[PDB]
Amino acid sequence: TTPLVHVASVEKGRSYEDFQKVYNAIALKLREDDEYDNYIGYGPVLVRLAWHTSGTWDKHDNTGGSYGGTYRFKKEFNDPSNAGLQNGFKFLEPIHKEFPWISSGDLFSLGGVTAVQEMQGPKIPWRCGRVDTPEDTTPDNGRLPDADKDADYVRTFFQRLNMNDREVVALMGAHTLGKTHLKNSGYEGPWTANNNVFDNSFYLNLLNEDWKLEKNDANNEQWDSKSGYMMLPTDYSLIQDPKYLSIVKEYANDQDKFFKDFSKAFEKLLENGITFPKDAPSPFIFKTLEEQGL
Numbered sequence: 001t002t003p004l005v006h007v008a009s010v011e012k013g014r015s016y017e018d019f020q021k022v023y024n025a026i027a028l029k030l031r032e033d034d035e036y037d038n039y040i041g042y043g044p045v046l047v048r049l050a051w052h053t054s055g056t057w058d059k060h061d062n063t064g065g066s067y068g069g070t071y072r073f074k075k076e077f078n079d080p081s082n083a084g085l086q087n088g089f090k091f092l093e094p095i096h097k098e099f100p101w102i103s104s105g106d107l108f109s110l111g112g113v114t115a116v117q118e119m120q121g122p123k124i125p126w127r128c129g130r131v132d133t134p135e136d137t138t139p140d141n142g143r144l145p146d147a148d149k150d151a152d153y154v155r156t157f158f159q160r161l162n163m164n165d166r167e168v169v170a171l172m173g174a175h176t177l178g179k180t181h182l183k184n185s186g187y188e189g190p191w192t193a194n195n196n197v198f199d200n201s202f203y204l205n206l207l208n209e210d211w212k213l214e215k216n217d218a219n220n221e222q223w224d225s226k227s228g229y230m231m232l233p234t235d236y237s238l239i240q241d242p243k244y245l246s247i248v249k250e251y252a253n254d255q256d257k258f259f260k261d262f263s264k265a266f267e268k269l270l271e272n273g274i275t276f277p278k279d280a281p282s283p284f285i286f287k288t289l290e291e292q293g294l
């Protein structure tokens, strides 16, 4: 099967203003629906949705990826690895209803960008142009990562997404948001206390907390700290591996570096598999509600 080329196609007549309006709608709803998940808000689940819809990509044949917006199809929607993401999708429904012109891929990815920025994270340049593809293009389940593995697994896994050591450690920093839910993944607990604030706390906790390898109620091992935080075996592997450890220490000691590196890696993640024409508009950098005085 010749590997497909997915060329970005700007939604007819749309420009920055249009997308800023969608961003604002998402941001306003994030502010409004703050009760979700014990007052954590929808920010974290939206970031996870953006990552999962993009993370199915395979550099070898360009299958999966954010372009097609295939999460809308049952096969992907029902992927066990996506348990819980239905919440993010339900949140996006009113947004898509108001702006029916935006593609699913653009909406899923924009939701992640909006959530990160609204949660005081770095600005993440974003490009429009993803086009909805048929149900038959939906990637099979099993392309997202397992959490009960080690550094070797993580390193190998991310090579399929064309991510190097630095990009992997930076991307994992997204765990500074939200928490694991036993019912969804078989893991329970937050990585950080301020889990709706995008900062480098994930790295600081990993390095400074006293972790104990314990078993949760789902009979799965996870690292727990007296402070009430947790780390998946894959998160902990970042301090077990010498190469990953140096980068963890770097981000734990440089907030700005983490922000810049995460911004680049997250945009790359959300753009994998997409060919942007030379005449395509430059990446958009949306203003937060706060910057707009809204």
Ligand code: HEM
Residues within 6 Å of the ligand: 044, 045, 047, 048, 051, 083, 084, 145, 146, 147, 154, 171, 172, 174, 175, 177, 178, 179, 180, 181, 182, 183, 184, 185, 186, 187, 232, 234, 266
């Ligand atoms: C080896 C890689 C990774 C593994 C094994 C992993 C695993 C997990 C697991 C098991 C959960 C809990 C889901 C639940 O129970 O609701 C989770 C949540 C989450 N992950 Fe990851 N993750 C990985 C990489 C990433 C990356 C690259 C990002 C994004 C840049 C990310 C963002 C999130 C966010 C924001 C949540 C919180 C969701 C919520 O609170 O609802 N993860 N991850």
Ligand SMILES: [K+]
Residues within 6 Å of the ligand: 176, 177, 192, 193, 194, 195, 196, 197, 198, 199, 201, 202
């Ligand atoms: K945090």
